[PDB]
């Protein structure tokens, strides 16, 4: 079975976010600009295995594209994709922390949710995302895992 149409929106928004042109993505993915257009513009549906290619093309782990789709399948929209900049920033700290700190590595369940828990804890404390650093986010991360 083929993939929902909103993956077009997801690929499209994230293309504009990574400051990538359809031509540049066409070289990375290997699909013609026309194929990418009809994919983004909603005209044809993206195959199950083509998303992995797009992930490499975009440079966003295909794992994450689905978690964004999961937010479309539930909420109707995707708040992560909406304010994706704050997400990309936090996820990269969550990632670095997982692969470099034992408390996180032997305790984390799912980096994606943990990134959201962290962004929600920062909004609750009225703290900007480009105002905190990797060392500060780690202290927060470690609290939310016990």
């Amino acid at each position: 079975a083929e993939l929902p149409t909103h993956y077009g929106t997801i690929i499209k928004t994230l293309r504009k976010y990574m400051k990538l042109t359809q031509s540049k993505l066409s070289e990375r993915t290997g699909f013609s600009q026309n194929t990418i257009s009809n994919h983004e513009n909603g005209n044809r549906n993206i195959g199950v295995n083509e998303i992995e290619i797009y992930g490499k093309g975009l440079g966003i782990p295909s794992y994450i594209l689905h978690r964004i789709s999961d937010e479309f399948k539930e909420k109707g929209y995707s708040p992560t994709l909406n304010d994706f900049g704050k997400f990309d920033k936090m996820y990269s700290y969550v990632n670095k922390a997982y692969y470099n700190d034992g408390d996180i590595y032997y305790s984390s369940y799912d980096l994606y949710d943990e990134t959201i828990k962290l962004l929600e804890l920062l909004k609750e404390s009225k703290i900007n995302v480009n105002d905190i650093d990797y060392d500060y986010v780690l202290k927060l991360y470690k609290q939310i895992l016990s």
Binding site: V48, Y63, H66, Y105, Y106, S107, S108, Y109, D110
Partner: protein, 127 residues
């Protein structure tokens, strides 16, 4: 090397892998399970796989579930020719119950590279 899989039901999640150099693909449950303390469950994933040649699939434990909730993976050898439903035998050795929900991460699938050697009897082996 490719790892072809196939969904056996609407309830299965495609195997995912975070890093490009991560040891295994995540395996997700397809159903809700409640494993009582000191008990075990064969958690179905509703996917079938075909592993690349020269390896078998090891269903390995997730470090989180193990360190924090005392969850191990029993059995866990997936043969090259196994084409049925990949199931994960979970051991709950904790004092509490453990709750598996559909879409939960419950193991990882590692493609352990192995030999397939021919067996040969001898009188004894030189030590």
């Amino acid at each position: 090397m490719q790892l072809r899989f196939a969904r056996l039901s609407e309830h299965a999640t495609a195997p995912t892998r975070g890093s490009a150099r991560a040891a295994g693909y995540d395996l997700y449950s397809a159903y809700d399970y409640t494993i009582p303390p000191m008990e075990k469950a064969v958690v179905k994933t509703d996917i079938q796989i075909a592993l690349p040649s020269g390896c078998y699939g090891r269903v390995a434990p997730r470090s989180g579930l193990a360190a924090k909730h005392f969850i191990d993976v029993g059995a866990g050898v997936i043969d090259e020719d196994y084409r049925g439903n990949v199931g994960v035998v979970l051991f709950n050795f904790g004092k509490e119950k453990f709750e598996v929900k559909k879409g939960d991460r419950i193991a990882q699938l590692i493609c352990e590279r192995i030999f397939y050697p021919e067996i040969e009897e001898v009188q004894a082996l030189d030590d």
